[model samples]
Target: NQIDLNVTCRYAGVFHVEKNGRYSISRTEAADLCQAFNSTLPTMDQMKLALSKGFETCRYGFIEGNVVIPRIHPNAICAANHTGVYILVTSNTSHYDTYCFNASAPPEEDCTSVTDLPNSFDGPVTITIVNRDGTRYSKKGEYRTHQEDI
Candidate 1:
């Protein structure tokens, strides 16, 4: 669980919750996911508040009215090759990650509370390392997918 450190009373802060990295969350599920945190799906303008505050990610979040992703800088992998708040085509049965907002009053001006969104990967296959404390990057995370006995 993680919360964005950049939270405030006015902004309330936005957090992500995703079951899978792909199109795994439906529109209904997106709303429900927010409820899990005592929150609701964020409006596009609300999400834009976060966006203007330097919050950007490659994943499409289920913002109200239309699904969108925030891109602070231009990138080929994100924003459908665009910049700023990128909106997706609205249609039937499309799935996305839930982008939620929490209005709970902050103990401090810097409010924080909510679970972080996680990315998914094809599992059951993991990396193994022969050495645990080697300082070099070559010493850890030896994946099962290897081509050399050397």
Candidate 2:
């Protein structure tokens, strides 16, 4: 399944949950929430992938990679000693937000057109056209439809 790291971060944060509630999020709760949205909590590898893609936040949230432990920023409260770094905090003791994951499918191709070539010695033939944007066109029938008309 396709995972949207950006959306995942947006869905999780301190603002969404109560001051203490945010930290109290358990790994099971995070997993359940993510399941509600047809998503899952990111794995350790997935979290690393998100970080590589520039995922950053000052608040803490439950991560799947290491159950119960919360992913934290190098902020004063979470990680004062190591500023500007991502760390893990105790789960039960800290109530944090939940990082949710979403499963997405690839975009579908937009059918522009379908075309039927002149009958060949073997049998009937047809062609389909497509573009980077998934837009495509083709001719059909003995009349030989044009790309634009399709």
Candidate 3:
């Protein structure tokens, strides 16, 4: 008898690039930078700081839950009549990446074609889902129309 096993490995990094110049700092340098800003290093107290400075304009490397998304502002819009799609990209068994789009429109269309999520999102909102592994997923984007009832 023979046994077969499969393994996959990936690399991750923080893609933080400032407009003044290119910057690549180690953990130690990051700590120093934090202190220079008169803030603690890598603590909950600096979430907004990290989002603004640490993720101003950078392609953060592959992260499980590193979505540095901002909270939806009050003036945000929503989608009602027009179809809006939410795309999710994931790695496949062949090590390739694939995208799944969850689309919704008003009037209650067939949700079977909806990749994962169903139902129309007609107002400013936030959606959260828990994956099979217990990891949480959150989406904070805008819609195209507004629901006056709400």
Candidate 4:
């Protein structure tokens, strides 16, 4: 006896579940990939280091100033501590702003809005990601300022 069956499948391209949500696959720059994806999942190696330091209650200090590091996920926008500065870090590559260490904070609240960060790829100023295991991953680099003095 032979049996025949019909099956239907739907595909919306390569969809991946990131911090923000699901995303469709498309040719994008390194920054775009990170911005649309999750930083933790993509930075698994770095995450290991962050985990070593502290994920739940991890804190680190930068020469510029001490920061109460937050457990940030991919695609999450972070405002700088100081004013007149803005950075948007992502998880694809170490390209421009893909990975940052020292960055200034935005003066106005609107600056940190998603629209302002729109996959710009301008990474963080100084950030520390902590894992549940108490590991810390540190990535330090220079920052671009929107204002002359901040």
Candidate 5:
């Protein structure tokens, strides 16, 4: 049992990229988008929970129980330089953003496939596969033809 060219892929980053605009996604659509992004809308407790700590964004997004945003610093377009969480009276179809929660994020890692030689290989090359014990088997190849085993 051995491994070759193995790489691990990780889903890592901010909760999500800002959609087309800040306030373009309806409540349902934002919920779906958050789900699609492997996260869900944050709940009121958690949203407010974040407010007590240090959380604030300018855009109005949907929480689990309401369409609102937590304000801490000055946000002119937001609650007009206010504090505390602000709730909005919005219809289901009304557009807004989403505060994605329970995001399963991981460390940054990239897995990639090496480009297939790109016709750049021209000389003799030996591909060797090793076993776990300590034995090694190799095969040789050249641009012209195969060299069987070695």
Candidate 6:
């Protein structure tokens, strides 16, 4: 069964304009800009996921993961080689747009019996899904869902 995760680009409608209009941006400013719009810089995995889902663009952008890398299309004007692959770029480099991930809000569901828990949690909580075969998939993050009743 196909899991219909309600995912979407926060700035989907304005993606091209924002990406093509910008000349260049520093990595630091890129992250800040994304946050200014209530989003965060996308990771390499996120970038790949977008591509797989038919998200296409000709501009390069910063992706955060093991290392800060630039996600470029094969025919991107800034791409050095037409390998049709995303490549890594240095963090301090100031010559690309930032790919932002608009995190979705958690879905509202029936809450189970409540138990006393810590008032605060430490560090980042990574959510994962373990299948019956012991395979795992990372729960990247929460996403938004929109529904209209006609």
lDDT of each: 0.53, 0.39, 0.23, 0.24, 0.48, 0.40
Worst 10 residues of 6 by lDDT: 109-118
Position 130, candidate 3: lDDT: 33
lDDT of 6 by residue, 2-98 (tens): 1111112322211211322453545564555455435677766665555554455555566564323233345535454443335654445555655
lDDT, residue 58, model 6: 50
* Residue-wise C-alpha lDDT for candidate 1, range 6-58, written one tens digit per residue: 11122436655555235566676566545544577788777777767666777
Clashes of 4: 26
Ranking by lDDT: 1, 5, 6, 2, 4, 3
- Better model by lDDT: candidate 3 vs candidate 4: 4
Among these predictions, the greatest lDDT belongs to 1
- C-alpha TM-scores of all predictions: 0.59, 0.44, 0.22, 0.19, 0.51, 0.45
For model 4, residues 1-150, the per-residue Cα lDDT tens digits are 111111111011111111111122122222233332222112333323332333211222111111123343322333434212122343352222122111132211211111112223345443233332334343432222233211
Off by over 4 Å in 5: 1-17, 90-93, 103-150
C-alpha RMSD for every candidate: 12.1, 18.8, 23.1, 20.1, 18.8, 15.8
lDDT per residue (tens digit) for residues 101-137 in model 2: 4434112211222122123122132323233244433
User: Where does candidate 5 have its weakest 10-residue lDDT segment?
Assistant: 1-10
Candidate closer to the true structure by TM-score (higher is better), 2 or 5 = 5
Full ranking by TM-score: 1, 5, 6, 2, 3, 4
Instruction: Report the Cα lDDT for residue 111, model 2.
Output: 24
Report lDDT (Cα) of residue 146, candidate 6. Answer: 17
Model 4 / residue 102 / CA error / Å: 8.6
Residue 75 lDDT, candidate 3, scale 0-100: 21
Candidate 6 — number of clashing residue pairs? 1
